[PDB]
Design a binder for this molecule. Sequence first.
Ligand SMILES: NNNC[C@H]1O[C@H](O[C@H]2O[C@H](CNNN)[C@@H](O)[C@H](O)[C@H]2O)[C@H](O)[C@@H](O)[C@@H]1O
Length: 433
Amino acid sequence: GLVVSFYTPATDGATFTAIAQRCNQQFGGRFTIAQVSLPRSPNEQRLQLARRLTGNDRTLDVMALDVVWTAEFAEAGWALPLSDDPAGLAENDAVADTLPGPLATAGWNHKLYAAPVTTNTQLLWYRPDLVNSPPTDWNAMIAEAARLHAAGEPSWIAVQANQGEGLVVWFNTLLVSAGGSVLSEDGRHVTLTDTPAHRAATVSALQILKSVATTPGADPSITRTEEGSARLAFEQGKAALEVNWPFVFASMLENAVKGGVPFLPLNRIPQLAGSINDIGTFTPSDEQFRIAYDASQQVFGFAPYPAVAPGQPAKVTIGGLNLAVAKTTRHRAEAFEAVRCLRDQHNQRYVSLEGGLPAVRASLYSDPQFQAKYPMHAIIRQQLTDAAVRPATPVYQALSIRLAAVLSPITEIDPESTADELAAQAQKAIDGM
Ligand SMILES: NNNC[C@H]1O[C@H](O[C@H]2O[C@H](CNNN)[C@@H](O)[C@H](O)[C@H]2O)[C@H](O)[C@@H](O)[C@@H]1O
């Protein structure tokens, strides 16, 4: 029958292809979901979609939107409100058994414009064979990287953050963790420097970025404008401390079994041979998972994101993907039906355990069979409960570009003057409304 296109980031395309294929057996030939890949960066994902939306591409049906695009797409009329479902089922489906942090990212002006499908929060990843105890705060992280550098041990702090959205994410986490915020609640004022408490938070966050950037043994790619991978730096043994999204867990086991992780040679364990399936994905039996996970715990551990203020947890910026129906669709009913299928319980288990993307369904975090294959479940749920959020604003794209340009390169941050430049550049973004 008809085709419901489903646009997703390319790096998630294989996972969402598998989910769509399952969702295609259950429609009785009524319609087919066809996954289509978007570029790698949040900005380029947005740009492709926005061009199809303003060009009235009537073949565009469902979109997996980064959480930061809700306000823009809702205000533009690009994402239909869930109340536009002709079946009247989308709003109830979106909220049922769904964690509240993800749902907050899918709303605008008191209505839902998307149904959460994946969430995200960054954890600390470390080498327990080199790091006795995982650092609990950023001053401790810096001390540990220095101690490692002294011992001729891998010394990079691998943070997912070059010159783009990931750097804004890192700054946002530090800033909110310190009690600050980029914008006011309504999104209409810049709050980086408008009170002494807010200025103090901004300066504290910038001090951490500068200190990490200039720790002995720091990654030489900080000043270069290339796009390194924190994930691969850690897997290659160049960092013993990494802060990153939880997909690094599935990557570590899979790549170790393929022989790509020097300090974790799971490829030499006979019981794991053939645990990579015919399309390249680690697909262990329960016993194979136990063997791989137990081996990995010697060289790979996880911990909460480091705090800014010692003694209480960080407030960690939330990420993820929300499913929206484009205003271009010719088939609203089928597009909202597809959204409900893509986020059902079975596909939520798959997106986390095979795809590495945290599920949004609250039940899974209380399910012992999920918890046994997703060992970071409790820290993830904790960090999703008191999450930092990036500012929700229709001019987010312009705001993020302006902030990233001030922050990068982080070796050049001067906390007091950089705080004023950040506030001035944020104001310019807000003024374009
Ligand atoms: N395949 N696992 N990768 C996870 C996820 O990472 C990105 O999204 C996350 O980071 C974004 C910032 N850019 N990071 N360099 C952030 O905006 C987003 O909210 C996070 O979910 C990828 O964009 C995404 O495709 C990946 O799924």
